[PDB]
Structure 1
């Protein structure tokens, strides 16, 4: 239990146990931690407590080192000295302990609550060890928050796909989301067995919801559902390797010329061979996963790792990847738990092939030459640190675009995160840019690539096929007719009551809307399925009827608006009291009482 101080790195065996994670503090550092904040509990390899029976006094400042133990002021031996003296707590390495004065941000993170934006702001702009400590603390806090939730008993199992699940009494029910995976428990009487992991989804109505499970071991009526958990694990690898530029290919052996369609990408593969690591910005539908597969084929004599966050993400990475590449493949991530069916191609545990498509949270002990990481719009400092702790390759590339939506982060209720303070990769790719941009998009229509370029983008990406039928019918938003605290903009749907017939070729369109309640209430009186952009980051749609909500900034988010337009092929419409958003989007403006 001897280690280096988390601030000055002098050897120490001191920790303040009242801090949740108990980091290694030096004598000076621990003194500053105990005199200023509320951590009035210090422990070395042995606890500091009045060893008198009946005297359970806690703080060290009121303790005195006795014959062999530490005792209070009262039960003190006559011959004894205190444990708080001259700014160093009594522990190992008193004379070589150096300390410093960076106790400010230390108390800031050790006393914060992560419920505000500013806490995450500071956690992104602090020192390296402080950054890892902040990540650790916020992961432990969100783990305890998720464990603060409870159970969910089954009312009726309609099918393997439709579920009637009621949640705990007097308990804040967990929303219909993909992240909260539920482990099931069925007691014989006698021996409660774990019946597997299950994911939920908002159905076409209430209360019967759609759900998927990892097993065909079907549910029952007496089962109870709780969200899975674990314990937060320590980390020792830093967040990011320093940059190292190279004047020549550092062992990277390329191919001759094999698929010359990737010439615009070889000009970047040479660069990836010129440095240690870089970043790439691939807008949704751009040369993203095509870039990486071309890097795979161009340098075919080097072990490469592919990684994402969600099973849907690693499968969206996996798709076209099995096309340009001999198979001769490997992408083995989950041995016993994919709530959704993950890889079904080859073995579980041999690290057979030189290209591997995995996830950061389930990366095994592997080595490679580059790990190309997509979805850097959703990773945190924790995932970066575990990337550095699990993979030690020769190159690295962070692919992704910050204009997408961030992590859930349910604890944020006062403020919002800017992507520049999302994580370190996003901070750098918005302060110095991704330093390697890829153009252009080819799937999305050109009318949502050049008109949407005017917003968070800088008019640099492009596509094709501008036609047709892309008009914004700005309706004046009505009063909030909310049932749940989430707003029902049924007056906004009042523009769609006369819409199911006037649209001849648009019957398979999609009703998308931010609020889950707005998707549900639409699903009551529906004509076509609903899928909010949160369920889509790897889904493409031909038509789309984007339905906005109240004038709050929750609806007028440029990031979510962007990520909600870029999931269309032919047409899309905007129905919002937009005062200024339609000035940067140049289509024909229509009004609701008029059918032209």
Structure 2
């Protein structure tokens, strides 16, 4: 009972072949049945021949034989075909108008979401078609990630390296990046979860580093299981309609303009005359400064600082304790940082994530790393918050979401989601003028590279940001990257200047950083998990020159973390000749 997802016409039927059970009206249901292998349709009664011992389920072969669906073998003398006249018999058989966008729905209902074209369709279809496509993609991705091992914790070394274990013939654990694992500790005869943890590659051979919430200790026998969830039918669209007001509706201007946020104050007015403000936020250039300056700019407006992961809200909390009074601040964390009141929608400043905040409505809500976000979550947030103003902090020239199912082709920075799609068509509305992190060295190169020279060269030319020439001798295994010639090269180069024994080692795959820390001793940094984390001295080796380690935005976000100097060892020349850095030889 409801409006069909292809016609908005009131129907009662759902395709049995589709996992998501989409409402389809008689005309559009018939079209979808005949357009794919969707011979299963669910209604008040499941469209199956309810005869003793029968198995036929297709609506085309089914006949309304009396008060029972029947095939030809089990039909009584009187029968009636359901799948007929281009509209299967059912509720409101007259008012089924039919649809035009049918084949896109069929391809959405049948694509495995492996080719890049599937995601192109997912980001280029109609509104509700895009919503349903995101729903189906989420369901498929969740049900795919349930064929792995149980991380039985054994030989806990210190408070970083539990050393883990696996259940022999099953585990395929991608310990890299944000792969959430929950821990279960068995007490007597009962068992109970502990909390989610991310896990990381870590030093040497099995000293795997962990990190997460649940500030408890750890114990042996607390086996970890890869988390899974359930999909909920989205309601809201990707983005609310945009309208520009003639005045700051519902807010009042500021009584004092702070100097550090004055450059952001020039953008703190137009956030108030439009429904939402789009920002091509440069990597780490005081986006948190913009957020806290807006908070101080509108102290009477109720603001929600939301983000995909809580580590993104970590910098928000840092800048909050920098300037935001603790009294009017909430830090919602489900069962990370908790220095505010937890799970309290009644607050001036609200800190939370996309997975824990319930339904609410504010005046302005900030949402960061919109490049990291997906249109599914971009609609979830709309189905949870109806704030007077929105703002989407994030530049698709920073990082994509890890679409692990995306195997064929690559997704464009605009095609990450809808808000990043308009990041190139309508572009930004405000912009972070002053560069709060990088000097002229990195800023000039990244601005001439992809930011269209709009990033002002902030500090002086570093001249310690060495670019290293190397050809490549690389070896790999099951899931780990190893570059022994590169490890030796960076060992030789690091010995030339002992001051570089503080530069963190960055790696496209954190197992290359693991073998480095086994030989180099420098800490590990994911090129993906690099935003926020920043150091004056950094050393990074490309390991491989492939698109997953040589795309422009990836190394942009990796290099925008170098405050003073970066030791970038690359095996390629597309960026080497593009880079205007200080060129050095090969150790």
TM-score by length of 2: 0.95
Report if aligned partners of 1:444, 1:464 keep a CA contact under 8 Å in 2: yes
Deviation of 1:271 (Å): 0.8
Structure 2 distance, partners of 1:132, 1:577, is 41
Report if aligned partners of 2:149, 2:170 keep a CA contact under 8 Å in 1: yes
Structure 1 distance, partners of 2:267, 2:114, is 41
Deviation of 1:439 (Å): 0.9
Change (3 A) 1:237 1:55: same
Report if aligned partners of 1:246, 1:274 keep a CA contact under 8 Å in 2: yes
Change (3 A) 1:192 1:321: closer
2:221 counterpart SS class: coil
Structure 2 distance, partners of 1:565, 1:426, is 21
Report if aligned partners of 1:303, 1:367 keep a CA contact under 8 Å in 2: no
Structure 2 distance, partners of 1:90, 1:26, is 10
Change (3 A) 1:145 1:285: same
Report if aligned partners of 2:332, 2:343 keep a CA contact under 8 Å in 1: no
Mean CA deviation greater in 462-471 or 273-282: 462-471
Change (3 A) 1:55 1:238: same
Structure 1 distance, partners of 2:260, 2:567, is 35
Deviation of 1:165 (Å): 1.3
Change (3 A) 1:534 1:577: closer
Report if aligned partners of 2:202, 2:524 keep a CA contact under 8 Å in 1: no
Report if aligned partners of 1:167, 1:173 keep a CA contact under 8 Å in 2: no
2:545 counterpart SS class: coil
Structure 1 distance, partners of 2:363, 2:215, is 39
2:108 counterpart SS class: helix
Report if aligned partners of 1:467, 1:570 keep a CA contact under 8 Å in 2: no
Structure 2 distance, partners of 1:495, 1:159, is 31
2:355 counterpart SS class: helix
Deviation of 1:350 (Å): 3.7
Report if aligned partners of 2:359, 2:383 keep a CA contact under 8 Å in 1: no
Mean CA deviation greater in 553-562 or 468-477: 468-477
Deviation of 1:253 (Å): 0.8
Change (3 A) 1:380 1:79: same
Change (3 A) 1:512 1:349: closer
Deviation of 1:89 (Å): 1.0
2:205 counterpart SS class: coil
Structure 2 distance, partners of 1:356, 1:216, is 22
Residues 1:380 and 2:374 aligned together = yes
Mean CA deviation greater in 489-498 or 21-30: 489-498
1:321 counterpart SS class: helix
Change (3 A) 1:129 1:35: same
Deviation of 1:221 (Å): 4.1
Deviation of 1:48 (Å): 0.9
Residues 1:276 and 2:278 aligned together = no
Structure 2 distance, partners of 1:507, 1:160, is 24
Structure 2 distance, partners of 1:534, 1:261, is 29
Deviation of 1:168 (Å): 2.8
Report if aligned partners of 1:441, 1:461 keep a CA contact under 8 Å in 2: yes
Report if aligned partners of 2:441, 2:460 keep a CA contact under 8 Å in 1: yes
Change (3 A) 1:225 1:470: same
Report if aligned partners of 2:330, 2:343 keep a CA contact under 8 Å in 1: no
Report if aligned partners of 1:63, 1:82 keep a CA contact under 8 Å in 2: yes
Deviation of 1:266 (Å): 2.4
2:270 counterpart SS class: helix
Change (3 A) 1:565 1:364: same
Change (3 A) 1:522 1:418: same
Change (3 A) 1:194 1:264: closer
Aligned length in residues? 586
Deviation of 1:278 (Å): 2.0
Deviation of 1:394 (Å): 0.9
Deviation of 1:178 (Å): 4.5
Structure 2 distance, partners of 1:433, 1:248, is 22
Report if aligned partners of 1:472, 1:573 keep a CA contact under 8 Å in 2: yes
Change (3 A) 1:197 1:580: closer
Change (3 A) 1:261 1:225: closer
Change (3 A) 1:208 1:129: same
Deviation of 1:265 (Å): 2.2
1:156 counterpart SS class: coil
Deviation of 1:142 (Å): 0.8
Report if aligned partners of 2:30, 2:88 keep a CA contact under 8 Å in 1: yes
Change (3 A) 1:273 1:204: same
Change (3 A) 1:159 1:110: same
Change (3 A) 1:355 1:485: closer
1:129 counterpart SS class: helix
Deviation of 1:564 (Å): 1.3
Mean CA deviation greater in 421-430 or 536-545: 536-545
Change (3 A) 1:214 1:27: same
Report if aligned partners of 2:473, 2:486 keep a CA contact under 8 Å in 1: no
* 1:235-281 deviation line (CA, Å, top 9, x unaligned): 11111111111112213211222424433322222111111112012
Partner of 2:363: 369
Residues 1:196 and 2:195 aligned together = yes
Report if aligned partners of 2:302, 2:362 keep a CA contact under 8 Å in 1: yes
Report if aligned partners of 1:307, 1:371 keep a CA contact under 8 Å in 2: yes
Structure 2 distance, partners of 1:50, 1:402, is 52
Report if aligned partners of 1:448, 1:566 keep a CA contact under 8 Å in 2: yes
Structure 2 distance, partners of 1:27, 1:379, is 36
TM-score by length of 1: 0.94
Report if aligned partners of 1:151, 1:168 keep a CA contact under 8 Å in 2: yes
* 1:537-566 deviation line (CA, Å, top 9, x unaligned): 111111111111233233321111111111
Change (3 A) 1:165 1:372: same
Change (3 A) 1:64 1:484: closer
Change (3 A) 1:350 1:188: closer
Report if aligned partners of 1:442, 1:463 keep a CA contact under 8 Å in 2: no
* 1:70-121 deviation line (CA, Å, top 9, x unaligned): 1121111111111111111111011011012311100010000011211001
Change (3 A) 1:551 1:277: closer
Change (3 A) 1:497 1:229: closer
* 1:467-497 deviation line (CA, Å, top 9, x unaligned): 4343545433233333446442222233223
Partner of 2:404: 410
1:572 counterpart SS class: strand
Report if aligned partners of 1:306, 1:355 keep a CA contact under 8 Å in 2: yes
Report if aligned partners of 1:284, 1:441 keep a CA contact under 8 Å in 2: no
Deviation of 1:401 (Å): 1.3
Deviation of 1:369 (Å): 0.6
Deviation of 1:437 (Å): 1.8
Report if aligned partners of 1:287, 1:439 keep a CA contact under 8 Å in 2: no
Deviation of 1:196 (Å): 3.5
Report if aligned partners of 2:284, 2:531 keep a CA contact under 8 Å in 1: no
Report if aligned partners of 2:245, 2:274 keep a CA contact under 8 Å in 1: yes
Change (3 A) 1:145 1:307: same
Structure 1 distance, partners of 2:370, 2:93, is 44
Deviation of 1:580 (Å): 3.0
Change (3 A) 1:448 1:253: same
